[PDB]
Structure formats: C-alpha cells, structure tokens
Write a protein that binds this ligand. Sequence first.
Ligand SMILES: *Sc1ccc([N+](=O)[O-])c(C(=O)O)c1
Ligand SMILES: *Sc1ccc([N+](=O)[O-])c(C(=O)O)c1
Ligand SMILES: O=C(O)c1cc(S)ccc1[N+](=O)[O-]
Length: 172
Amino acid sequence: MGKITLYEDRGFQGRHYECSSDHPNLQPYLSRCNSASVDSGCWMLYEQPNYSGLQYFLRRGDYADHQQWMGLSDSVRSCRLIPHSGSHRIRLYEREDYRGQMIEFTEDCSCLQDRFRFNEIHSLNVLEGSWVLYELSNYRGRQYLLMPGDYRRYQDWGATNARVGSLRRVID
Ligand SMILES: *Sc1ccc([N+](=O)[O-])c(C(=O)O)c1
Ligand SMILES: *Sc1ccc([N+](=O)[O-])c(C(=O)O)c1
Ligand SMILES: O=C(O)c1cc(S)ccc1[N+](=O)[O-]
C-alpha cells in the first residue's frame, strides 16, 4: 500500500486529497499541486494525466513546495504508486539493442560518467527492481521511471534523448 496527500497550495495548505493508489486523472479534484506529504510508498507524480509528461519521483516525506520534488511547475495530474522491489539490477549499454560496452549496476549512481565514460546510454536492461533515470548528474534534470524489462532504445523509457547523468533505485 501507500498514501500521499496532495495539496493545492504551498506549505500544506489549500484543498487536498489523500490517495492510496494509482490515479490516472487528478484534474477533477486538484487544479494544481504545490505541496505533498508522502506517508508511505514511492510515488511518481506526472505533470500530465495518464502518467505522461514530466515525471517526478517522491518518497516518504513532506514537500512544502513543488521545487522540493524538482518540479518545474505546480502541474500534477496523475500519480502512480511504484511497486516495491526487493532487489535492483540494471545493465546500461553504449549502443541500441544491447550492443557495445555494457555496465551493470546494483546501487545508486550519482554520476554515471564517473563509471561509464559515455554521455549517452542507448539501451538498458532493467533486470531487477524499479529505477529512476536522471538526465543530469546528481539526480537533476528530467526523470524517467524504469520498471523491470527490456529497453532497446531511449524512446522506450519515455526520453527524447539518450542523455543519462545519474540513476537511483526506487527504494525506501
Ligand atoms: S519505494 C518505497 C518507499 C516507501 C515505502 N514505505 O514503506 O513507505 C516502501 C514500501 O513500503 O515498500 C517502498
Ligand atoms: S555510479 C556512481 C557514480 C558516482 C558516485 N559518487 O559517489 O560520486 C557513486 C557512489 O560512490 O555512490 C556511484
Ligand atoms: O478519497 C480518495 O481516495 C480520492 C482521492 C483522489 S486523489 C481523488 C478522489 C478521491 N475520492 O473521491 O475518493
């Protein structure tokens, strides 16, 4: 299970809604989201309905404004409870379709290029667990939730480029 309370206004003010599960469409309920309290679960907030647009990873804790989840705006129109995983393993590849140099991680990586000297990651195999891939180092820029499965090209994880600077496990 999980539980998040979404507030329209900064600092946990305004109209609010308590969500226990995936909600593909917040628009009837919240016209904006400027703070959130995550009681439990790892959540992905989405700028757009039906889990599209900019994605923001949130874990347990309180966020007094949208900048605290790296939000570019107060637009939150869907949210997903990310399934718990008990282990994490990801392979990153230089080229598409699992070709070229590969590196395999089981831990968080704040600076990819420190370990794998490629600015671009063209395919990846998420063998175990859910991960968040970040465009920039130190968990900045655009975020992309990765669930277990095969990603033969960067389009498969919802990005418009292959730039990857950091990545983290979805874990408590
Ligand atoms: S990814 C994640 C975050 C928080 C929690 N939690 O317990 O609050 C879980 C979990 O319950 O597995 C997972
Ligand atoms: S993959 C990776 C890159 C950078 C760092 N770092 O500390 O800067 C690590 C780490 O040691 O956790 C991992
Ligand atoms: O109570 C809920 O859990 C609830 C949550 C959201 S996010 C929107 C509508 C809801 N209603 O109407 O039940």
